[PDB]
Symmetry: D2
Subunit: 242 residues, 4 copies
C-alpha cells in the first residue's frame, strides 16, 4: 500500500522544514528512515514521533555536512541500523541567507562555507552511499537545493544550486551502469504562515504558494520504482515562478 | 484509494502504445476516461476492455487531430459523457517516422503534416479543454511528445517536440492564473520485445530500456493533486539517453 | 579589411528590418550578397543602393518562403550570380503578429501558416543551400527567429522559434562532418524610435533597447572564419530581457 | 582599426594557454591590458613581448586567485596603471585535473580548492572591478571556464563551471542597471599538438579541434561595443562536442 514499502532511506537536513516533512512522508509510505541533521535533539525527537511506541522504522543521527568524516560516519550508522540502503535524499537558515548578499557586497568566506556544506556535503554523502546502493542492486540519490527577484540576491545559494545540478548529472552518468539513479529537485518559494507572503501570488503561475509537502511528494515519486527510468533530471517545483 | 479518484481525463492517441497504456493506468487509478484516436474501432475495443461488461467509466471517441472541428467535437462529447474535465493528456507511426528523413532529403509536406498533427492538434485540444478545466476549479494539461540516433534523424519530429514544449510554457503562463497547470513529458526510447534493442543499452545510463508504463507513471504523478505546484515543466523520461 | 572578404551570402527577409540592415552590413564587410524577400521591388531597390550605380556585389531576388519551389529557385539564382555560396542567413509582420493571439483565441490556420513560413521555409532554404556550402569547402547557416509580453502572447511565434532552434541543432549535427556550421540568433525586443518603448527599459538589464545593428553584428561574428569552432549554438541578443 | 581601441582590460590566468593568447589578441585589437597570473615571471615576460621596445600598453601583475586580498590588490594596480577599466576577463593545470577524479574516489579538499579558485576568485575579481566599470560609464565582465566523455570525469571542474555560469547571471542581473554586461564562454576541447588528439574528431561536429584563438575571438566579440546588447549569456565554443 505504501509507495516505498521495504525501502531504506537517508534524509539529511531532516530536523525541520522540507527535510522533516519529507522524512515523515517517506516513513508514511513504508520506508525505513535515517533522519540526519546538525540538530541532534530535533532529529531524535522527530525519529521518536515517527516510531510511535511500537515502531522501529526511524532513527535520528547527528551529522555535520561540512565535516566529511561526520558525513561518512552518518551513512555507516544508517546502514548498520537498517542493514542496507535504497534512497539517499541530500537536503541543503534565515541568518544564513541574510549573509548571502548581492555580489557587490558578497563575503568570499560565506561563498566558501556555502559550497562546503551544500555541495561538498552532498558529494561526500553520495560517495559514501554509492557502494551500498550498488550492492542493493541499485537505488537512487535525490538532491534538493534549498527554497528560492531571486537572481537579484542570494548569489552564493544560486551558484551552489547550479553546482548541485551538475553533481546530479555527474553521478547519474558515473553510477548509471551500476543501477543508480540520480535526480535533483529545485523548489521555488516554499512556505514552511502563507498569508504574510501573498504579495508573491501574482508572480506565481499557480493560485497558491508552495508547501513542504510539494517537495516531499516529488521525492516520493522520484524515489519510487515507477520512476526508475528517470535519471539525471532536475524537477522544478515552483508553481511557475521561474 | 486510486491516486486519481473522482477525476475525468481525456487521452488522445489512446488506441495503442503509450496512449493506450496510459488510458488503462488512469482508469486503474480511479479516473473516468475518454479515449480518443483516429482508429475508431481500436479505441472502442479498449474502452470496452477498461469498462468491463457492466462498467461505465471509459468511452472511446473517434478523432482526427489534424482537423480542428473533429478535435472540438471530441472534447465536447467527453465532457457531455462525464459532466466535466480534470485532465487533458495530449499524446503525439513507424511509416510516418520512416518518412521523417534527415534534412538533406526532407520533404516539406511531411514537416507541414507533422506540425498540423503534433502541434496544432494539441493546441486546439488544449484550447477546447481550457474553459472546462477552469470551470471545474482548475486542472491540468499534459503534453507527451513522441518517443525518440537522436538529432541525426527525424528532424521534423524533433522540431515539433520543441514546439510542443514552447506550447506547454505558453499555456502554463496564460492559464495559470485560472488554476490550470500545463506540463510536458519527453519520452526517450520506449519499447511498446526488449531483446532486439539490446545494442542500445550502453547508450543508456539505466540498466534497462523504457516501457510505456514509465510514461504512464509520470502522467499519473503530474495529473495528481500532490503535483499541483508543478507547471511549465518538462519531465524527461529517457533513462539518461540524453 | 572587411571581416567577410570574398564571401558569398544569401539573406532572406532582406527587404526591411533586420534582414535589410544585416544585408547592408554583410556587403560592407566585403561579402557578395543575394537579397531575398516577398517584396520584389523593395529588395531590388535595396540591392541597387548597396551596389551603387556601378557596383555588382548585390542582387535582389523575389522569393515566397512558403513555397518550396520558389525557395529552391532563389538559392539557384544566387549561386548562378556569384558562382558559389558561403553563408545562408534565414530571417523569419505587425498585422501577422496581431493575428498571433493567446491560445484561448488562437486560430489553427495562423499556426499552420506560421510553421510553413518560419520553419519549413528555413528548412527548404537550408536543404537547397547545403550542397553548395559543402562543395565550397564548408560554410554556415544562421537562423534568426523573429524579435520578441513574452510567453503571455504570440504563442505560434514562440512555438516556431523553438522549432527553429531544433532545426538548427538537427542541421549542425547532420552537416558538421561535411564542414557546415549552423547557429541560431534569438533577438529580444528590437526597435527597427526608442522613445515610445521607454516603459520597457526597466524590464531590460542593459540601459538601452535593441537595434537591428545588434543582430547584424552577431551575424557578422557567427558568419566569420574566427567563429568556425562554433556550431549548434543559440546566441540570445536581448539585453537581458529573458 | 582595432575592434577594442581605447579599451582597458584585465585578463587573469594570462601566463599561458587561452589567457595568454587572449591577452595578446586584446592588445592587438588596441586594448591596454593588465595580464595577471600566479606565475609572476611568465606574465612579465609576455607583457614585455606585447609592449615591444616602444609600447606601454601591457603590464604583468602577480595574483593568487584563491587570496581575496591578492585579487583586490591586482585590480587596483591595473586601474592605477591605466587610469580606468572596461573589460574584466576571468580565466579559470594537468595535475590539477588529474586530481579531479570521478565522484566515487573524489577528494572533498580538491572540490573545496577548486571552488575557492575558480568561483570565489572570479566573484572577488568581479566585485573589485564593478565600481570601476560603472564609473567608466559601463563595461563588461567575461567569465571563461577551463577547457572540457566529460561527465564521466572531472566532476569538480564541471560543478564549478556551472556555478560560474550562475555567477555570470547573478552579475548581469545585479549590475545591468548600471551599464555592466556579464557573459560566459564555455570552451570545449581546446588544443594548446593537434595530431595526438585526432581520435576525438568524430565526436566533434566541426572538421577540426579547438584552438585558443577560438576562445580569444569570442572574447573580442563579447568585449566589443557591437555586442553591447548581449548579457547574461553563455557562448559555447566546442565545435559541437556538446
Amino acid at each position: 500500500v505504501g509507495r516505498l514499502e521495504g525501502k531504506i532511506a537517508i534524509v539529511t537536513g531532516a530536523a525541520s522544514g522540507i527535510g522533516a516533512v519529507t522524512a515523515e512522508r517517506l516513513a508514511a509510505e513504508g520506508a525505513r528512515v535515517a533522519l540526519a541533521d546538525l540538530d541532534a535533539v530535533g532529529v531524535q525527537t522527530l525519529a521518536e514521533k515517527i516510531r510511535g511506541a511500537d515502531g522501529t522504522h526511524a532513527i535520528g543521527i547527528e551529522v555535520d555536512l561540512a565535516d566529511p568524516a561526520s558525513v561518512r560516519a552518518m551513512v555507516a550508522a544508517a546502514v548498520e541500523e537498517f542493514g542496507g540502503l535504497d534512497i539517499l535524499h541530500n537536503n541543503a537558515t534565515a541568518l544564513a541567507s541574510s549573509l548571502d548578499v548581492p555580489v557587490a557586497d558578497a563575503d568570499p568566506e560565506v561563498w566558501d562555507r556555502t559550497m562546503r556544506v551544500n555541495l561538498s556535503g552532498a558529494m561526500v554523502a553520495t560517495q559514501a552511499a554509492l557502494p551500498h546502493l550498488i550492492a542493493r542492486g541499485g537505488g537512487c540519490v535525490i538532491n534538493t537545493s534549498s527554497a528560492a527577484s531571486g537572481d537579484l540576491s542570494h548569489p552564493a545559494y544560486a551558484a551552489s544550486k547550479a553546482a548541485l545540478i551538475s553533481l546530479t548529472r555527474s553521478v547519474a552518468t558515473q553510477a548509471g551502469r551500476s543501477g543508480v539513479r540520480c535526480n535533483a529537485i529545485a523548489p521555488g518559494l516554499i512556505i514552511t504562515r502563507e498569508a504574510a507572503y501573498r504579495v508573491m501570488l501574482p508572480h506565481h503561475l499557480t493560485t497558491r504558494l508552495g508547501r513542504p509537502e510539494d517537495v516531499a511528494s516529488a521525492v516520493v515519486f522520484l524515489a519510487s520504482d515507477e520512476a526508475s527510468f528517470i535519471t539525471g533530471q532536475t524537477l522544478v517545483v515552483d508553481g511557475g515562478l521561474l
